Amino acid sequence: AQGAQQIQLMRQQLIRQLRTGLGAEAVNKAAEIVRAHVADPQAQSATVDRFLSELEQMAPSSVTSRLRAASRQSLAALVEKFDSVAGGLDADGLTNLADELASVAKLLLSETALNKHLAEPTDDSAPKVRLLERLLSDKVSATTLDLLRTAVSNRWSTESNLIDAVEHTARLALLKRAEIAGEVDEVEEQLFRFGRVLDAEPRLSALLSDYTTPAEGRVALLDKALTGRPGVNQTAAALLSQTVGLLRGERADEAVIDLAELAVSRRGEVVAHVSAAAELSDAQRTRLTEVLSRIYGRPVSVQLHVDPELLGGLSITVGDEVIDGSIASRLAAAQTGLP
Amino acid sequence: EVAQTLTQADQQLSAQGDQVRSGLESSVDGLSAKLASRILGVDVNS
Amino acid sequence: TISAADIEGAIEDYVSSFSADTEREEIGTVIDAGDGIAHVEGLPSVMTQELLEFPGGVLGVALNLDEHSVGAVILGEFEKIEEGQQVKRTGEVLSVPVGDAFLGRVVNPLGQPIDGQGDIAAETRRALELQAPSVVQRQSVSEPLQTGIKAIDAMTPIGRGQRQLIIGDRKTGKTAVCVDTILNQREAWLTGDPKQQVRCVYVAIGQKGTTIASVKRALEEGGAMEYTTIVAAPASDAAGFKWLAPYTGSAIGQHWMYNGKHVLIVFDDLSKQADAYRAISLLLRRPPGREAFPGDVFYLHSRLLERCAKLSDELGGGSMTGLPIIETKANDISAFIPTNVISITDGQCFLESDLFNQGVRPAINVGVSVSRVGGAAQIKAMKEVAGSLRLDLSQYRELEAFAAFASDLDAASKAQLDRGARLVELLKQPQYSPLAVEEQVVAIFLGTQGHLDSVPVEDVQRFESELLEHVKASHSDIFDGIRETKKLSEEAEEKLVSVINEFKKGFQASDGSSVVV
Amino acid sequence: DGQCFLESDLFNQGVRPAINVGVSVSRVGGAAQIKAMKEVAGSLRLDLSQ
Amino acid sequence: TAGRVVRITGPVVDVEFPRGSVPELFNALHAEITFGALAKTLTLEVAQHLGDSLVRCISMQPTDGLVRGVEVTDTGASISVPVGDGVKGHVFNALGDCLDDPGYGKDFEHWSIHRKPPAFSDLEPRTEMLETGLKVVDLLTPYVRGGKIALFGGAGVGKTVLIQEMINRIARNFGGTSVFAGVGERTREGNDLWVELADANVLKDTALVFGQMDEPPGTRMRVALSALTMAEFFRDEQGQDVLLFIDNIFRFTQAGSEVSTLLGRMPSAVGYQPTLADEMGELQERITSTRGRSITSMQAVYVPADDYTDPAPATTFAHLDATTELSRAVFSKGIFPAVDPLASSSTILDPAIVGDEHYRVAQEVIRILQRYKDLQDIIAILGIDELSEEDKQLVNRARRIERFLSQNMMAAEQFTGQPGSTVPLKETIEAFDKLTKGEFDHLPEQAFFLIGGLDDLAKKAESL
Amino acid sequence: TAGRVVRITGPVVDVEFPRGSVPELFNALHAEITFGALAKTLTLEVAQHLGDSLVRCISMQPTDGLVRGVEVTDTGASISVPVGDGVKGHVFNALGDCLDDPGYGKDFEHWSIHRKPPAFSDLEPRTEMLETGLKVVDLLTPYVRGGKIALFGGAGVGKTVLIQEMINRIARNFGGTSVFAGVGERTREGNDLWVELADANVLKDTALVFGQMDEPPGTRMRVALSALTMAEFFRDEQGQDVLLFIDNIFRFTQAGSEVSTLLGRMPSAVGYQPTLADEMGELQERITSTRGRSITSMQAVYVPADDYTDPAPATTFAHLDATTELSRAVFSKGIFPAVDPLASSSTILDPAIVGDEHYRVAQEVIRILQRYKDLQDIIAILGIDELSEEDKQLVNRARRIERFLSQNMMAAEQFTGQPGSTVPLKETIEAFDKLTKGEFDHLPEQAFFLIGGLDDLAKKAESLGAK
């Protein structure tokens, strides 16, 4: 009986082996067939349209992190103060204020002792404020003094959070002046393009991220190497130069991506890094933005990342959540789903 | 006896498995076309 | 003969229904990996113990949830993990398929067959962490689980729903005892009545693959493989599988137990699971305690072993009996893990190397082996005949120092010594030879009624066996009576005595001495 | 490549050098002796252990 | 004001609260696991204030299925258990939830399980003896009222019957109640105890609190405190004498060690928690007599590796007032309760406490029994006839004494129809004085099994 | 796309790579040391992905003279070693470089030293005695052809001598290929084995792979994998019975521990790495026979401080089909081989395989020796005269049995000048049956010490004036 059972087991082992071989060759031929069919751009457009239709039927969902409670609350207070200041300050004063805040932040980063004294949590605000005037009461304008006094009058879990908050305020001021100019979309696009190229050129990002070297040399390199070109927004270049100058222990391309994310968040949008297999159409782009906004509610700014391996569909990723309509992903699923 | 039956069955089933592999090489086109149609979401004749 | 119709049928069915529509997936990224642990940033909504899919079909378990990342235990092929890989959350805690189709199959802790015998049809799925039956969902343990070993069945009886630890040094016969129990369940299986049948689960944790193959071969020889399932976590498996294997076996057994079936589950052995869990915990940087174990190793084993229970008749009356194995070093039962498991379980069978070498096989130390369930796990005949064994053996062990001075011993004490010698020889049992409960009852009746007093020690074993043959050959009605009434009636007792006396007239001792009267 | 175990109990008993014969050993053996010494002392260590 | 989960590491959960809403130490917080298979409400006991509005908590239930960021609610008080007469006849867990009838006791008054011992000035300075009514305990190992009694016994020596007997006697004579605390309780044995107490009809006199094997260390650590809180209510509020059973106290110590390890504390000698003595004191110091009422505790003690110098038993024995050994030999001899009269001991068997006559009779009984124990081996191997005439006289007297140390227990009524007996202490003293003087040697041994005072002895003698 | 050295701490090196260029786990990287005295090319094995494009690596050679920031080149694969029939008769190191003839084997096929074990369905239990000619081994722990054999023992109890004896008795006339793996043992012993195999004409069938105790932890970790890869090629590809000798496998474990704490993982009990059992399981499970493909593997397992409860030997025990436990107590008595009969074991010592007479005689010998061990302390204190007559007979019989279990081994002549002897299994069974029956109780016990069969016993007894 066990011998006959062994015969049957070996028979169906062979059957499973043959099924696996047939499935493998069939999926390989299907991959070749889809590769041949997808060459036509009309096929690209049809696949993207079908994925958009599928998304439109998708039921809407509902759902810096590294800051702890005290640092996050103090940053919230600082941004609250900054908005009120900037509203009256207006664009030119915003330029001056951003430069002054960046200089103050790099000074704080340099003088570790001063940073520690201004960062240690304390009950009262009179001593810290008093020292702030005693240091730079008249050197910089009143707006910067008020913002710095508010920044140091609050509590921070770690001292580095203070420098981070000041840098954030300076970035916010630059973004606010950009908004006043009304070319916010231009700076968004420039920042995202710079992030993409820095990521694609890790050597340059590593060279910039070496904060041991003087800031002036790094910013000069950036000006005369990458960000200084006829087709560059002035405000985006200023933001990139500011972040690199103040950079310390942070990935450069990651810093640029953070600038872009903050810039889009200024108006409340959500950045959706849509990676399509080909350049999209205006109608398709608008339809995609609308459907993503409906799914996630909040307005969505879509950044396109073309790539051939996708073969179709859109591999959307927003807010740590991915909708993978890629045709290549479908091929992988077909191959791996076999018995 | 179990061992000799096992080996003779092994050789015969290997032979007929090669034969069935030869036989099933034909219908691969249809199955691959069906799979491609399903993944693409639109039927493709090729 | 392999038909080509099914070959095409399977693939055409698969492709025709290859619906791979898109869906929203929470993603994370591997930020570091090492030694079978991967830390994954992202996955904000992942649950503790959630299964995670890494690229290439790799699986992990989310164990450490932090504000920075998730430390996950990779369940296999850890070398494929790389920094930057995308990790998906399945949305499920660990679960295994369960069903009657798992009988006769060898699977890994995820339920995937490894015997190469094809697919296993799952009746349903069951989470590994489903809570144990509550204190009010049980009833008293009152049904014997016959191991077929006279030593256990008489001295440390095991009832259905009990957790009896098998603890001893290496090569003392622990696996032999467990496999003997599994084989002894064959007659109950053949009965066909589920109220008598026992499904068996054998969890092999950390054993080398050829050892598991040897155990499976032994089970095949005895026909036990029709009602046995083997969950294999060989030594080459990731620490995650070694840590999960007992829980997989327990989940399968629980599926059977909650449907009114009776299950015997063997864990061979829990010490290796504890070692694997300690490895995982240390690699996760969890605080170590005594012997470097984490603070919840006792919880590990206690939650595992409390799922073996005798359910109340409202829930179906099914049961699961646990036979955890613990390997001690230098006979140190006061080590951390032996102490924990001894505390957790109902009774202990202590196997000793010195007894094994002395010829006492199975090498169970009846002096220290205990069964808190006791007589409730014995049939009436067994309880009656075995009543005097404990005191007889204790007195014999006390008197063993006076072996050579029998002239100075009073008549009673020399009788005690001789009876104890015969009884020790009685409890010996060859490997892979379980005895039916009626056979054990008759053998113990021989020992404790003084019918062995006229036989030399060196012949007792042989005598016993031959007598058991003789009865089964010509006086099977005694075995019937015992089995179908669970008691030794007076008429049966007298008939058995006459049969014993006739056999003694027939018996030939090794040295030619007459064993008559 | 072997060891000469020295014991204080052997030293106090008068065994000087206090080499514990049973556990002391050389892993080269006769190869490290001249022929005559190897002949006379072929099994001296085993003799003394016994 | 509600917090949210930040870190989950096994039973340890870190929770972040708003700036000024951090729970007090030992507060109970409630979280929710919504995953269907494992859906439950987690009770988290606050263990440490990590700073920056984070608290480290021990989960009382397994954290499998718990998600980061889920809301954590503060109850504003530590673990509280229901108190009052309504808890008797019911089974609760360390958290106060009723097991035999979920939802029961939710409207009862609830007391925090963390309470201080009676004020030093409120302690009854003078030790007092607990007149159980059992001859062996009253004479040889008297129990201290408001004291602690270690109980030692293997399987099948009548330990459960002795617990039933103590419940019966405390309920009947003293008009008291009983709280059983199963620390590290096996679920099978918990169910068995529940059913057996129901069968004996003493479940109505007892409140059962189970922290089981398969629960995380926190509940096994706090179940003794929960049962102690119920007993403290019975003593201080109902003005009753309470008998608290703890089984096993060593498992309370081991759960404390496990929790300490989980919280990152460095182990002290032999791997135990650094605060082992402090934890044991916080527990055992609440079991005392105050305001004329008392909690007396009988505790099962496990000794690791039989090492009485091991830190856990060494710490526990600092608080124990008496010890009661249950011997399989005595049980096999049919003597009930199977108390080993020689190994069992009491720290108040002292003329200062029990008086001169009691002490003298006890010492004489101990001497006779000890010398009979010495003669046991000679009698067994060489036979009784080998003994001298004085030796045989002493053997007869000692056998009679050890048989009279047996008694017909109230709990024994269910098994054997004969009802139990209570022997007044003075009657026991005079009876054993007579026995040690040989004033009963002429009577047969059988007259001395499972009887009460001298009246019962005589009456059974005329029955032979 | 090349990495750079960031941190150097002993045998562990941290390397930073450009994002997207991080080597996979167990990849082999190359770094240059250009200091004149110690100039070399370090091979680094990627052990961990530390994050931020940093990888922690184990160096296979001493890192002396290495400089932070130097270029690290990723080979894209794991450490690979030559495989084929050409490796026979040559000595390789853990990295696959031939030592006797440098440059040899570089054109061969190369196999990665990291491999998965055979599938469970392919495993077949092995039960076939491998007669050796040693009385104690053949009687009480019979070896399994195609099975796993270990020699446990403390330091300097006779593990290496017994390995050489088995090479003389098993590998000399073996049909197939032999692979010897020196794992963290003495270089002098490796050279001696090389010369001995060459002189015995066995080298041409043997592949030697050496990583000595003087090498860094990484080499001692991976030499076993390299030798096992060679053996696996012979088993799976060439299809011939393989003899695999490993000495000492414990070193593998030790090597891992030496680096474990430098790799950032908290120590386990007794200072071992937490991954002790898992690494050991991977390695051991790779060493096995599969259905129709035989590897007879014999491993010497060091037992630290003579402690058999140590985690390393305790974990190794589970992986063996037969174990010969060498004891310091037996060694100190002058009994050689210093086998502890009461502790050694074999899975084929049962009546089904070895037969009823062999099993009966072995059980009787074990029972007698166990009783002798039990009575030894009584004899030490109270003296032998206070035993019963049967106990006195048993003591005499047991002393003679334990003497007769000793044997003059072929490899031990260097230590005694006495040529070795070989005893057939049937003669061993008959002789020990006679001993247990008391047939030789009259001969002096010294007549049983370090001899061969019964003829040698008679001759030695005659030499002592007894018959």
Ligand SMILES: Nc1ncnc2c1ncn2[C@@H]1O[C@H](COP(=O)(O)OP(=O)(O)OP(=O)(O)O)[C@@H](O)[C@H]1O
């Ligand atoms: N009753 C018995 N009679 C004779 N030999 C037996 C008996 N039980 C076990 N043995 C033998 O004892 C040896 C050890 O048995 P077994 O493998 O079951 O023990 P173990 O404690 O599980 O061992 P390990 O530590 O290897 O897992 C084997 O040779 C087995 O055949």
Ligand SMILES: Nc1ncnc2c1ncn2[C@@H]1O[C@H](COP(=O)(O)OP(=O)(O)O)[C@@H](O)[C@H]1O
């Ligand atoms: N005084 C007594 N009278 C009658 N029966 C008793 C007495 N004491 C004990 N027994 C019997 O002995 C058994 C002892 O078991 P148990 O009470 O559970 O003690 P343990 O918990 O130590 O095993 C009980 O089942 C009971 O029936």
Ligand SMILES: Nc1ncnc2c1ncn2[C@@H]1O[C@H](COP(=O)(O)OP(=O)(O)O)[C@@H](O)[C@H]1O
């Ligand atoms: N069979 C034997 N006969 C005589 N001496 C031996 C024998 N085996 C070992 N020895 C002695 O014991 C020493 C230790 O043996 P060896 O195997 O080299 O060490 P290890 O046990 O550490 O491998 C040897 O160098 C030798 O001197």
Ligand SMILES: [Mg+2]
């Ligand atoms: Mg085993």
Ligand SMILES: [Mg+2]
């Ligand atoms: Mg050696």
